[PDB]
Design a protein around this ligand. Structure first.
Ligand code: HEC
Ligand code: HEC
Ligand code: HEC
Ligand code: CU
Ligand code: CU
Ligand code: CU
Ligand code: CU
Ligand code: CU
Ligand code: CU
Lengths: 454, 454, 454
């Protein structure tokens, strides 16, 4: 009568091995139901949500999303939740897929330095979100308290070459996007569902550049995709590919051959991809400003031979991926820390500005600052730049239009304002430009930009 | 050629018996098509959207959602809409599932004190939203003008033990969440899709506590779930359970074994649940701040024997459900009315504060005010509280951090601000605390809190 | 091994014939794979987003959405993107359905006056969004850079009587809804996902009135429905009908017999409708304030015989469709241009006000200004209006309640405020009323209303 009716646990008790994102535990590879002991510890800690931007995350297992749990339908799971002594808050857990009130919540309340346990049978196959369930629930979830549990079918999932773990969340900082420093949680933005960041795996760039997911032409890739929310619904999409299969939770329905699929807040799906041609495939929330303005992009990078019969074109670059085309933006972290320490050098600024110039400025002005004849004026050896570095701050913040002369040529176009750039970002970008391409050197400070903005 | 081609109406004309939420009319239990006469009356009236918060609802049949209508595919429906003489606005109806322009709208315009009628054939089986269709349509829908009509398949739906009627809506008050008094509709929040409340069945607590839906272990429950909007899409989810089946409108596709499912604005679904273990199962919009900060939670409470093989844990409490764990919050309504009348007593405040303290404060400070050793300081017989009741107002509104001494013990933690609490709520909560646990008595007034907030 | 494995291209190279919305190219009607040459040109230009409201759109082929492209699964597509010399920005393309990084983006970067090309095989059948992929991607998409490409199955889609092309988008103007003039793109509203317009096919009224889609009773209609976003998810719905079929992208799953269906940002679906009774069927985003307050309504108008057995009622009118019931609102465009030119006459205002009065005022006051006895007072020959035209400006902006006397009769009701109306709209509406129905004439100016609003 109950699903998952495979008899009492047999064999030996199994201690679950949990993995950190973006990795997944191995398939259970088991033909009998077991007692599975799961131990998960809550840790509150600061981490970088973006370069030079710290946030106090609340985590299951030290990561956002939390550690991945993998069991078999019909297993009896003895769930142990610990809360690290350093925690200020109590925490608990609601696992979707659990049959019982709160998905475990009332029997997993755990004060700092304590441990709780409860037992459940995994009656329901599927991929499922788990999350904290402690008042105020939204604050806990917003601070990163979510992950995935996979309950396998008894026969296991079909074999694939790679399995990965990707989870979207919306985040609410007091400061604006890319404003540096330790950013508090912002309850007002959270209630209004107005996130400052929308991320995969807890940070900007968590899955881009040198942190990309990998596979090779011809391989299959399964991705366990969660949406921790707390509030957003993801228009989840793969740029330049298709999903062979998309299956939500433990649903009977499987959709095949779709590129764009809606993942509810608190939802999860298993997607399958087959690599056909090399290059970078971007996982996004196709509510586009999330993907391109708030951090909601991840990369699956495929290595192998080009097939000109299928696609003649080139790998992605900064025109599309912006400043996440490059391996990383570590120079930005280093410049921000140098500013805090009072040791910020011109070169710290130049290297940070170099990272930030990609896409943001280079789409028009080019990576070498040459511009494009008749269309975009040069930043390289620019007389107009050199003539008035203050004017340049105004141009970045407030745009520029009308006829101008640069290096003896007339331009009569429109540079849109870029007011969303933070003071340090404008300063560092301009300091990069001034110290490149035979420009006159010197520097622009965040304080200089603050004054022009005001 | 047309669907629902079951011949002319036969038998006798049937006068439809409509039900008020959360109840549903009985199955039609009929093998022939009939002429079904439906009579529905619009009533504009004030009701409580939350305790002590009045709202002028516009209703079909006196409730939000409106009366449930149940007919059989192939029926000829003669639809009579009356508008009560007390109405200020004209009203009409668009029933999804109707084949014809506006779903009835142009032939159901009805001024106060009037009646309109129109006839349609129910060609389409399914569950369908109906709503008002009078300019400005969004205002009408926002004020509560929506419900469900079920068009059964000719053979009927499979028998279940219980059928219930649950409908989500987003609401737009001029005041903030839980600000007392008669709250006007707020057009600006509505246009921006920024609701102050997100509710099931027209009120906070409409389906919680003593108003929960009921069933017993082993029983099946069918829920007709609507989303009246006007604007939100529900990440509709059952905490601690799974839906055996989810079917949208009259779709051919049926999803099985899912826990989280997206319901469009203006959409409807039929979900099935089988009770397996006792306790409270929470229906939520899993865009979490709606569920936990704006009212979007309902309860299906299952009675019966525990099954420790399936779930070893406990029923839900205020850690998860907050102040909706208790049967009701009537003390809040009574205190608010006493304030209006100028008769507010200390005990009125104490009992209101008692209701509001649950979850909101008790998650940390505990239901007996004892706190937790080394972690959360006591409110019970608190020297620190007694020493400066004004400081306590500041602590609730603006939080507290750093080393403090309470009852001879050091704490060095963080109480987050609770600025979203209204002045009366802080006043009543603190008055409760002061009159409990050997604390010194007295009271805090809403005016006292207003001054500290300013 | 790869899908679409139908061999090398054969026959002659085919130059694709692209269509402008809401039309679709003819079925490919071809049994062999071909080399298909597609030429699409980007044009930046001002167009009217609403009457008297200009916007600088960025377009593929001069329209929003862009030109429709129709090919066959297994075709080799040689894609040529041109950027008109008048462009200020560079542009490129990402076609969903393309197998390769960026869906073409890196190999289609095209400066003003240039052309790019790349080749891909259409491995994936389905309906797919294409869009620009140039940093800042959200700005490009927000400015109108999206369209659809259909990749047919090898056997073709089933024949229907009509095929149409409808695409939703969200738009972000600096000014509020219906504020006249050339409206800049508003980055802040875009990041916050707070659109001022939500439209089908690039403009208010693009598919209403004299621009409605057409078919006849008994005919089948296929609509290729895109959602360009950038940010919104459409609760896509047909008022007064049902979709026989809804199929997303190239998915295997087909839903049948649904009225309301969620289309992701960047998503696309093929829907089928069978006309059964005459009248206007409204395609909306059923997040209702979008449909009724921001422009998100389109019409499929069915001609033919009434069938009283199916629906006894009347065609839609301004009670539901508001000011889009009429063929067009050209008088508003003409009045706005007359204001710019300094030649605005009383009659220009009267005719603009006539257009705007429909629904907005007529729902209560009636199309002849008679009101409804005991319920809504007359505007026709209104003593109360004539007595104080300034008071009338205040009534429109700020509402009216309480007992009043009009033409010898008492009213004691509530006219809600209509503060969202722009100054010119109030002026023109009141000038219409004053010059109708034996009212005293004269005029109200936008400046008059500006002063009352302040
Ligand atoms: C294309 C959309 C651009 C992006 C992105 C950026 N800039 Fe730009 N810039 C652009 C144009 C079309 C113009 C000329 C405007 C005109 O009136 O014709 C400019 C101009 C400048 C200048 C001044 C001229 C010069 O020295 O060449 C500066 C200093 C400049 N732009 C800097 C700059 C930086 C630092 C950018 C990233 C932050 C950036 N621009 C983006 C077009 C575009
Ligand atoms: C956990 C998240 C808490 C919730 C919810 C509430 N309070 Fe709290 N409170 C908390 C901590 C960790 C502290 C100490 C902070 C420190 O600096 O170490 C406090 C403190 C108080 C106090 C002062 C100390 C005392 O008298 O014990 C008061 C008066 C107090 N808290 C009241 C209070 C009320 C009324 C709450 C609901 C509105 C509430 N707190 C919530 C932790 C938490
Ligand atoms: C119903 C929801 C209404 C809509 C839409 C509009 N008006 Fe109205 N109006 C309405 C009522 C119930 C009243 C009387 C209020 C009372 O206190 O009883 C009015 C009144 C007016 C008046 C003044 C009285 C008169 O001259 O008849 C004016 C000038 C007026 N209304 C104008 C007006 C216009 C121009 C509207 C569209 C912009 C409009 N009203 C909408 C009800 C409703
Ligand atoms: Cu927690
Ligand atoms: Cu959950
Ligand atoms: Cu109404
Ligand atoms: Cu509707
Ligand atoms: Cu572009
Ligand atoms: Cu895309």
């Amino acid at each position: 009568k109950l699903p998952g009716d495979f008899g009492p646990p047999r064999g030996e008790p199994i201690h679950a091995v949990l993995t950190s994102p973006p990795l997944v535990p191995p398939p259970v590879n088991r033909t009998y139901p077991a007692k599975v002991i799961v131990e998960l510890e809550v840790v509150e800690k600061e981490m970088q949500i973006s370069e030079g931007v710290s946030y106090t995350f609340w985590t299951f297992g030290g990561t956002v999303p939390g550690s991945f749990i993998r069991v078999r339908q019909g297993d009896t799971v003895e769930f142990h939740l610990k809360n690290h002594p350093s925690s200020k808050m109590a925490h608990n857990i609601d696992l979707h897929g659990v049959t019982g009130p709160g998905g475990g919540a009332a029997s997993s309340f755990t004060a700092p330095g304590h441990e709780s346990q409860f037992t459940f049978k995994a009656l329901n196959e599927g991929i499922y979100v788990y999350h904290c369930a402690t008042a105020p629930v939204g604050m806990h979830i917003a601070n990163g308290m979510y992950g995935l549990i996979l309950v396998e079918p008894p026969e296991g999932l079909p074999k694939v070459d790679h399995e990965y773990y990707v989870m979207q969340g919306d985040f609410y900082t007091a400061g604006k996007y890319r404003e540096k420093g330790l950013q508090p949680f912002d309850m007002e933005k959270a209630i209004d569902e107005r996130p400052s960041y929308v991320l995969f795996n807890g940070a900007e760039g968590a899955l881009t550049g040198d942190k990309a997911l990998h596979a090779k032409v011809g391989e299959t890739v399964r991705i366990f995709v969660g949406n921790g929310g707390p509030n957003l619904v993801s228009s989840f999409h793969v740029i330049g590919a298709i999903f062979d299969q998309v299956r939500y939770e433990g649903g009977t329905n499987v959709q095949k051959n779709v590129q764009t699929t809606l993942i509810p807040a608190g939802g999860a799906a298993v997607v399958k991809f087959t690599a056909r041609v090399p290059g970078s495939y971007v996982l996004v929330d196709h509510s586009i400003f999330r993907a391109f303005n708030k951090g909601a992009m991840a990369i699956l990078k495929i290595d192998g031979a080009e097939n000109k019969l299928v696609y003649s074109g080139k790998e992605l670059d900064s025109v599309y991926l912006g400043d996440r085309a490059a391996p990383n933006m570590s120079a930005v972290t280093k410049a921000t820390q140098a500013s805090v320490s009072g040791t910020l050098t011109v070169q710290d600024q130049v290297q940070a500005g170099r990272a930030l110039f990609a896409g943001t400025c280079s789409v028009c002005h080019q990576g070498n600052g040459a511009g494009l004849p008749g269309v975009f004026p040069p930043l390289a050896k620019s007389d107009f730049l050199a003539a008035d570095p203050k004017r340049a701050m105004n141009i970045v913040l407030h745009g520029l239009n009308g006829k101008i002369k640069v290096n003896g040529q007339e331009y009569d176009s429109v540079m849109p304002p870029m007011t969303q750039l933070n003071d340090d970002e404008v300063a560092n970008i301009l300091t990069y430009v001034l110290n490149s391409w035979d420009n006159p050197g010197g520097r622009v400070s965040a304080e200089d930009v603050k004054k022009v903005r005001a």
